[PDB]
Amino acid sequence: MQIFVKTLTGKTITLEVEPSDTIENVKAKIQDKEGIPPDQQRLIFAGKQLEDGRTLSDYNIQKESTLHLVLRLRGSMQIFVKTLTGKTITLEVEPSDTIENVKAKIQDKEGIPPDQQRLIFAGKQLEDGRTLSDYNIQKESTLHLV
Amino acid sequence: GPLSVAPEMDIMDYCKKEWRGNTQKATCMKMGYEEVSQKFTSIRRVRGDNYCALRATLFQAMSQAVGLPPWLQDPELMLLPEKLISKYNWIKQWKLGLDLVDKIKESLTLLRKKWAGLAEMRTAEARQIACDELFTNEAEEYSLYEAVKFLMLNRAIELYNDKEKGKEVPFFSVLLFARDTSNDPGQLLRNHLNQVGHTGGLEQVEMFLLAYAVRHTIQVYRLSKYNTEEFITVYPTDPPKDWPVVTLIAEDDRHYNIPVRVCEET
């Protein structure tokens, strides 16, 4: 069975799915088609937000029926990456974003290798797996790099 | 002081400054900008303080203010903050960044006044000159966001009620209130609106809400989405004939900045 996942720009993603599939599955599916990490994802059907564990059959969802994707991701966070050169790197972020993801942006933005990036906050080195949220980084917190 | 809306910077020099790693992703950022830079000469760095969404939009809408839109011109708007508070008391659960009804009324009154100042302008140079000195400032600006957020909440109520009455509403609102943490206007407020300018920004579904609140269509270049349907994302998707339009840019859905038109230039 095909189903459709709609975004809030009306963009339609087609998936091949089975009744016995989970939402964890579908979110994971949507990650290839579209890159979106599952944590960001909500799926809505019949005005209900679907639970990861329960199956498509459970939600009485059918061939050619349409789910809606409503992401948790938000607008307006910025933070600062002070450097050895003096250079301040200003990063567009989401509290959700992992240190792992940051190292990665940082490489994106001005070309330094994460296996070499020593990210600090208030003197604490930074679990690539942990996130900004858990580290209690307010909008406009300033960080150091080594 | 990290200014609200930085002066116009050549966009081509910008993507060059900011996208200087060797990464695959960076390329997509560069290409994103290249497209934009055909319509737009320059870019204005909006401050990334969790208000970026409202600041960007409202800066735009107001800088280009041609006439004062009627919704603002209506003076029942003044009496609306008292009304909502009377009816829905949980609105006292309101969480400021910078008694309570008076404060909001004052905030909204400010918005009406300031926006009319820019409409009654003669030149558009004058109009915009004027508008940067709004956002230069500290306290006045942040009041405007308490007004807008209010207007968002008003509208959220308005719509939720209509949905429940069986009445025809915008589909985004259906999904707005489908969220576990945003089932009803109360829930939205406690969990989403209050945290704006504190913990977090607007979700995309709430961009929708924003446009509705101020009756301006928001149109966004999302670089992340370059070479796809969504690259120029529009809130709302099927905007009204009349509603004026603001253009914003979002590298990766996490902050909003302002692309400057060729003719709108300083």
Residue numbers in the entry:
A (entry chain B): 1 to 146
B (entry chain A): 78 to 175, 183 to 350
Task: Give the original sentences from the paper that presented this experimental model.
The methionine 1 (M1)-specific deubiquitinase (DUB) OTULIN acts as a negative regulator of nuclear factor κB signaling and immune homeostasis. In turn, LUBAC activity needs to be tightly controlled and the deubiquitinases (DUBs) CYLD and OTULIN cleave M1-linked polyUb with high specificity and efficiency (Keusekotten et al., 2013, Komander et al., 2009b, Rivkin et al., 2013). Whereas many DUBs react with ABPs containing an electrophilic group at the C terminus of a monoUb (de Jong et al., 2012), the substrate-assisted Ub chain hydrolysis of OTULIN relies on a native M1-linked diubiquitin (diUb) as a substrate (Keusekotten et al., 2013, Mevissen et al., 2013).
By replacing Gly76 in distal ubiquitin (Ub) by dehydroalanine we designed the diubiquitin (diUb) activity-based probe UbG76Dha-Ub (OTULIN activity-based probe [ABP]) that couples to the catalytic site of OTULIN and thereby captures OTULIN in its active conformation. We incubated bio-UbG76Dha-Ub with the catalytic domain of OTULIN (OTULINcat, residues 80–352), which is sufficient for specific binding and cleavage of M1-linked Ub chains by OTULIN (Keusekotten et al., 2013). The probe labeled only active OTULIN, because C129A substitution in the catalytic center completely abolished covalent attachment of the probe. To verify that the ABP is able to capture OTULIN through its catalytic cysteine, we crystallized the OTULIN-bio-UbG76Dha-Ub complex. The structure was determined from crystals grown in similar conditions as the earlier reported OTULIN C129A-M1diUb complex (Keusekotten et al., 2013) and belonged to the same space group with near identical cell dimensions and low root-mean-square deviation (0.51 Å for OTULIN catalytic domain and 0.55 Å for diUb). Although the resolution of the OTULIN-bio-UbG76Dha-Ub complex was lower than the non-covalent OTULIN C129A-M1diUb structure (3.0 versus 1.9 Å, respectively), the electron density in the well-ordered active site enabled complete building of the thioether bond formed by the reaction between the Dha and C129 of OTULIN. Our structural analysis of the substrate bound to active WT OTULIN underscores the rigid constraints for OTULIN-diUb binding and thus the hydrolysis of M1-linked Ub leading to the high specificity of the enzyme. The mutation of G76A in the distal Ub moiety severely reduced the affinity to OTULIN and completely abrogated cleavage of diUb by OTULIN (Keusekotten et al., 2013). Indeed, there is very little space in the active site, and the alanine side chain at position Gly76 potentially clashes with catalytic Cys129 of OTULIN. Nevertheless, despite the apparently lower affinity compared with the native linkage, the presence of the electrophile Dha is sufficient for being captured by the Cys129 of OTULIN.
